[PDB]
Ligand binder design. Structure first.
Ligand SMILES: *[C@@H]1O[C@H](CO)[C@@H](O[C@@H]2O[C@H](CO)[C@@H](O[C@@H]3O[C@H](CO[C@H]4O[C@H](CO[C@H]5O[C@H](CO)[C@@H](O)[C@H](O)[C@@H]5O)[C@@H](O)[C@H](O[C@H]5O[C@H](CO)[C@@H](O)[C@H](O)[C@@H]5O)[C@@H]4O)[C@@H](O)[C@H](O[C@H]4O[C@H](CO)[C@@H](O)[C@H](O)[C@@H]4O)[C@@H]3O)[C@H](O)[C@H]2NC(C)=O)[C@H](O)[C@H]1NC(C)=O
Ligand SMILES: *[C@@H]1O[C@H](CO)[C@@H](O[C@@H]2O[C@H](CO)[C@@H](O[C@@H]3O[C@H](CO[C@H]4O[C@H](CO[C@H]5O[C@H](CO)[C@@H](O)[C@H](O)[C@@H]5O)[C@@H](O)[C@H](O)[C@@H]4O)[C@@H](O)[C@H](O[C@H]4O[C@H](CO)[C@@H](O)[C@H](O)[C@@H]4O)[C@@H]3O)[C@H](O)[C@H]2NC(C)=O)[C@H](O)[C@H]1NC(C)=O
Ligand SMILES: *[C@@H]1O[C@H](CO)[C@@H](O[C@@H]2O[C@H](CO)[C@@H](O[C@@H]3O[C@H](CO[C@H]4O[C@H](CO)[C@@H](O)[C@H](O)[C@@H]4O)[C@@H](O)[C@H](O)[C@@H]3O)[C@H](O)[C@H]2NC(C)=O)[C@H](O)[C@H]1NC(C)=O
Ligand SMILES: *[C@@H]1O[C@H](CO)[C@@H](O[C@@H]2O[C@H](CO)[C@@H](O[C@@H]3O[C@H](CO)[C@@H](O)[C@H](O)[C@@H]3O)[C@H](O)[C@H]2NC(C)=O)[C@H](O)[C@H]1NC(C)=O
Ligand SMILES: *[C@@H]1O[C@H](CO)[C@@H](O[C@@H]2O[C@H](CO)[C@@H](O)[C@H](O)[C@H]2NC(C)=O)[C@H](O)[C@H]1NC(C)=O
Ligand SMILES: *[C@@H]1O[C@H](CO)[C@@H](O)[C@H](O)[C@H]1NC(C)=O
Ligand SMILES: *[C@@H]1O[C@H](CO)[C@@H](O)[C@H](O)[C@H]1NC(C)=O
Ligand SMILES: [Ca+2]
Ligand SMILES: [Ca+2]
Ligand SMILES: [Ca+2]
Ligand SMILES: [Ca+2]
Ligand SMILES: [Mn+2]
Ligand SMILES: [Mn+2]
Ligand SMILES: [Mn+2]
Lengths: 587, 242
């Protein structure tokens, strides 16, 4: 609810390049600056003879909003022999998936084709480039001697990637073994050490891979999406992957152990061709240190109130337990054909309430099919089914692809050091990426005491040149959890006997202000103590109004001056949603 | 007595050489019994294979013009969907087309059948659907079929709008540009045009496609045999109307 939609950062790349097809963060060595990583897989590069090789751009947040290309590879197509090109980097879609861990940036080219070393083929084995600062290495675990469709020729390694917490890379290859799919995991120490620009098929000893199975499992697309998390309660991040065409297009999700590549748990879709497993994510949502599984089925069709089918997409929420089981619920999308569940980005604790939160995108929802991102908060019992914030697309669809706002996103990284994790949302159809900054959340506890409750018609006590008067005591306390100033300036308004509309007969007004309303600018400090203030209001005489039946409601209203509570970046805080309002009592 | 339109959608993929002669015996046989229960009979024809993009077809210069290479065999190149015959009364022209049909090829067992169904459904002009008639669409293939988001591997991420995209060659021109349609999209366009989709597959593919017919309203399933008069029993028992 606290994402700033008033002033978001708008980053752009070359037009027609699918800028924003893959997004991620960048946090290098020590306490340095932070960056946005954006993929543009259809981008023309300067590579000799390479048309639309694609690139990954490093955009700076600090200021100026300027993007700089990351040089992963400047060379053209290597030759196996004279007039015999070895590889085809044109239209390789480099930057279709970008994943970053600390000072490491991993980008891949799923449509990279490679010619066999035995004969003249053009097989899309896929390749990745890894950058650990200066050194840039190549990574093609499917570029092997296991050629042809029966092998890894159409593996398309790097279609999806992720990092574990123990410096292992997780790669998905949907085409391996006649499109059975395959997961490959290698230690980062081995990837760079065993790299050799003169060796096209490098064999890694600590490689973990899903070996080939029976022919019935062909055309399954194992590795279509990936995510990481601990599930067997040991400490080693395990491998989760969607298998959307398994079980006769029912879709499945396979879980493998992150140590010896063994199947741990299975999920199965409940509707044919719902693409159960298109997107997956793993994050602990209910504060139990057990990572939880989120499976998107963007093509899920539900039944409407009128009995007609409607494609809305579905995400299943499965809460991990120590007893090994899973508590699974299902979350249906809101808009028809929006493909709710196409992208799922763990956000961390977006609002710093003690429970992680998550975003789910419907890239083709909203007006003019521009795109919507839904924000969901966690709680003790799990994920809140109702969204607390709706991110709207602003960019209309020029002829061709729709804006696809939300199609890829990544969270759980605090890019402005404001104490709250932020969110990058890619929209490749309009070649754009947008940074939404989380606003600080102010929790306010307001109090209102009216003593006495019963006002006598003639109780003269407070000094006056003496009339029936009473004390109005209102207390105010505020706090926040993040990087916010100490001094929050409040402007508080009080209205006596509001129930009487403008034109009626009023019966209350303060003693010295001589006015039914009193304004007061209030500087209070969060965290210190509750600051309270008393003041005296009185009732009018009996002969001035015959209306002694209309109960006199004392109304107290309070607001904040955000401008003096804003940050150096102009990020204005925001109140918690269930209790921001004013309060009322009555005498 | 009531007008009826019947479009014949044949799969020209590689896995259909063993079933080709059964399909031609289905064409001529269907081009006979239709004139029985009705006089207002017009039938059409269309063929499909697969989207001509990697990884579904090899991208080597020889296997593009001849995807049956390395076997070796001569067959037609890989194409998404070709609208050959608009539905008309001339039924002997229908037979002359099915006879000359040759096999094509690709790599991955499921095909782009849904692309052909979507283009034949929405195009009420280039196919020529009557105002008030029974729009029947016979679907024939001996394997599975690709649906939405499967073209992401090929590099196609623009969804299918469910519109008429037939060029001057009467082919699916926006096949390498648009994704495959989903079952939701097909359901949304088979009712706007009111089309009854008959699935005619092989034994091993019925248990799959029958669950598809459960989702798609009005769509039924059928089995392919040497005596292909079985699928004819569907249509005759589909003229019940009422
Ligand atoms: C979650 O769900 C998923 C999906 O359901 C599930 O993952 C699958 O789990 C099933 C569990 O049964 C796995 O099925 C097993 O697969 C084994 C395959 O590995 C070996 O077997 C190959 C068998 O070849 C087949 O084809 C030939 C004809 O070509 C045929 O004759 C055979 O009978 C067989 O059908 C074998 O070829 C292969 O060997 C390779 O390497 C050698 C060199 O060493 C090379 O020469 C070969 O050419 C090949 O390249 C490989 O070693 C299979 O062995 C295993 O068999 C068991 O079951 C049968 C039937 O009950 C018994 O008779 C037999 O004795 C065994 O007990 C079994 O079928 C399937 O592979 C998984 N799929 C994956 C991992 O992708 C998860 O388990 C689920 N999760 C949980 C927690 O359950
Ligand atoms: C590939 O790796 C996987 C894991 O990385 C290996 O799977 C392991 O198999 C061994 C068996 O060889 C198991 O050890 C057994 O433990 C029993 C006691 O239970 C302990 O493990 C529990 C695991 O956690 C549970 O909960 C999670 C949910 O979070 C479940 O998913 C999981 O399945 C478990 O149910 C702990 O929670 C618990 O506290 C215990 O510590 C032992 O009883 C058992 O047998 C022993 O005793 C026998 C006689 O009593 C004796 O003969 C045996 O030799 C043995 O000593 C055995 O020790 C591991 O638990 C299991 N891993 C996991 C994570 O569960 C897999 O074997 C490996 N494959 C290869 C080829 O290397
Ligand atoms: C006629 O009007 C009179 C004035 O409007 C009424 O007199 C009021 O009587 C109530 C008791 O019912 C008093 O309330 C008490 O207040 C004490 C002391 O609180 C104060 O002290 C703390 C610090 O120690 C300070 O922080 C507070 O702000 C207060 O200043 C409480 O401890 C008691 O529990 C009790 O609630 C009022 O204080 C008193 N008014 C004044 C101005 O003194 C009188 O009751 C009316 N007659 C009627 C209605 O018949
Ligand atoms: C990346 O660069 C390539 C070229 O290296 C661009 O491909 C070019 O695309 C244009 C149209 O987008 C092609 O021109 C067309 O020619 C026809 C005539 O046949 C004309 O009628 C059209 O109006 C259009 O002008 C051009 O031939 C083609 N170039 C090559 C070498 O194939 C590509 O568009 C660039 N992409 C991005 C994102 O920058
Ligand atoms: C005090 O603030 C509250 C905010 O909670 C106001 O309540 C709103 O009342 C209007 C109409 O009376 C509704 O349309 C809004 O939906 C209410 N807000 C919420 C959050 O539900 C209340 O009106 C304010 N006090 C006065 C006197 O206006
Ligand atoms: C409080 O400050 C506001 C501006 O925020 C001003 O309009 C108002 O006059 C001030 N009130 C008093 C009592 O000084
Ligand atoms: C019948 O077809 C004619 C053109 O052939 C068209 O103008 C008319 O709208 C159609 N009627 C209905 C009910 O579709
Ligand atoms: Ca583990
Ligand atoms: Ca959990
Ligand atoms: Ca939270
Ligand atoms: Ca932040
Ligand atoms: Mn086929
Ligand atoms: Mn066959
Ligand atoms: Mn195919």
């Amino acid at each position: 609810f606290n994402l700033d939609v008033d002033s978001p950062a708008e980053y752009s790349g070359p037009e027609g390049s699918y800028f924003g097809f893959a997004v991620d963060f960048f946090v290098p060595s020590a306490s340095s600056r932070m960056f946005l990583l954006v993929g543009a897989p259809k981008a023309n590069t300067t590579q000799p003879g390479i048309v639309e090789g694609g690139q990954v751009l490093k955009c700076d947040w600090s200021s100026t909003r300027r993007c700089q290309p990351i040089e992963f590879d400047a060379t053209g197509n290597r030759d196996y022999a004279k007039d015999d090109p070895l590889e085809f980097k044109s239209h390789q879609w480099f930057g279709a998936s970008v994943r970053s861990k600390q000072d490491k940036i991993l980008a891949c080219a799923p449509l990279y084709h490679w010619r066999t070393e035995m004969k003249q083929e053009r097989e899309p084995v896929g390749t990745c480039f890894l950058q650990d600062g200066t050194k840039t290495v190549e990574y093609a675990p499917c570029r092997s001697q296991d050629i042809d469709a029966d092998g890894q020729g159409f593996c398309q390694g790097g279609f999806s990637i992720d990092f574990t917490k123990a410096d292992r890379v997780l790669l998905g290859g949907p085409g391996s073994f006649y499109w059975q799919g395959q997961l490959i995991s290698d230690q980062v120490a081995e990837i760079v050490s065993k790299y050799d620009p003169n060796v096209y098929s490098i064999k890694y000893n600590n490689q973990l891979a899903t070996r080939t199975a029976q022919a019935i499992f062909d055309d399954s697309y194992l590795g279509y999406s990936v995510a990481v998390g601990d599930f067997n309660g040991d400490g080693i991040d395990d491998f989760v992957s969607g298998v959307p065409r398994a079980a006769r297009t029912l879709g499945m999700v396979y879980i493998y152990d992150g140590k010896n590549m063994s199947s741990l748990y299975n999920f199965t879709g409940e509707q044919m061709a719902a693409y159960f497993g298109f997107s997956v994510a793993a994050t602990d949502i209910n504060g139990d240190d057990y990572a939880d599984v989120f499976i998107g089925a963007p093509l899920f069709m539900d039944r409407g109130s009128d009995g007609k089918l409607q494609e809305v997409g579905q995400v299943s929420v499965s809460l991990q337990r120590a007893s090994g089981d899973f508590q699974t619920t299902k979350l249906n999308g809101f808009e028809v054909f929006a493909r709710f569940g196409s992208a799922i980005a763990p956000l961390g604790d977006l609002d710093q309430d003690g429970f992680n939160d998550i975003a789910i995108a419907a890239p083709y929802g909203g007006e003019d099919k521009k795109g919507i991102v839904y924000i969901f908060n966690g709680r003790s019992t799990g994920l809140n089914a109702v969204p607390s914030q709706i991110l709207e697309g602003q960019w209309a669809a020029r002829s061709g692809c729709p804006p696809s706002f939300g199609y890829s996103m990544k969270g759980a990284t605090d890019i402005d050091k404001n104490g709250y994790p932020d969110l990058i949302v890619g929209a490749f159809g309009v070649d754009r990426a947008i940074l939404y900054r989380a606003r600080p959340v102010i929790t306010v506890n307001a109090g209102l005491e009216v003593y006495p409750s019963i006002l006598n018609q003639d109780n003269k006590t407070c000094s006056l040149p003496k009339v029936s008067c009473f004390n109005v005591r209102f207390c105010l306390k505020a706090d926040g959890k993040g990087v916010l100033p100490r001094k929050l300036n409040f402007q508080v308004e009080l209205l006596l006997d509001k129930l009487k509309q403008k034109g009626a007969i009023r019966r209350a007004l303060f003693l010295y202000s001589r006015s039914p309303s009193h304004s007061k600018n209030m500087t209070i400090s969060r965290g210190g103590l509750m600051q309270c203030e008393e003041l005296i209001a009185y009732l009018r005489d009996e002969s001035e109004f015959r209306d002694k039946l209309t109960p006199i409601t004392i109304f107290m209203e309070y607001r904040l001056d955000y401008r003096t509570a804003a940050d150096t970046t102009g990020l204005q805080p925001i109140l918690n949603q269930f209790t921001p309002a004013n309060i009322s009592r009555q005498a | 007595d009531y007008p009826v339109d019947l479009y014949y959608l044949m799969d020209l993929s590689a896995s259909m050489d063993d079933d080709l002669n059964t399909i031609k015996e289905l064409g001529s046989r269907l081009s006979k019994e239709m004139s029985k229960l009705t006089s207002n009979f017009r039938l059409g024809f269309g063929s499909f294979v697969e989207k001509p993009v990697s990884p579904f077809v090899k991208t080597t210069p020889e296997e593009i013009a001849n995807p049956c290479s390395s076997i070796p065999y001569f067959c037609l190149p890989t194409f998404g969907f070709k609208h050959i015959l608009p539905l008309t009364n001339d039924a002997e022209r229908f037979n002359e087309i099915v006879k000359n049909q040759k096999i094509s090829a690709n790599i991955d067992t499921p095909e782009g059948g849904f692309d052909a169904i979507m283009q034949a459904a929405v195009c009420k002009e280039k196919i020529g659907w009557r105002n008030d008639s029974l729009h029947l669409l016979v679907f024939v293939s001996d394997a599975d079929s690709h649906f939405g988001m499967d073209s992401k591997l090929a590099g196609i991420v623009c969804p299918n709008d469910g519109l008429c995209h037939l060029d001057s060659k009467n082919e699916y021109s926006m096949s390498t540009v648009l994704e495959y349609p989903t079952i939701g999209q097909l359901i949304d366009k088979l009712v706007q045009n009111n089309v009854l989709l008959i699935f005619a597959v092989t034994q091993e593919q019925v248990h799959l496609y029958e669950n598809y017919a459960k989702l798609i309203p009005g769509a039924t399933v059928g089995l392919l045999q040497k005596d292909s008069g079985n699928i004819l029993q569907l249509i005759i028992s589909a003229y019940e109307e009422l």
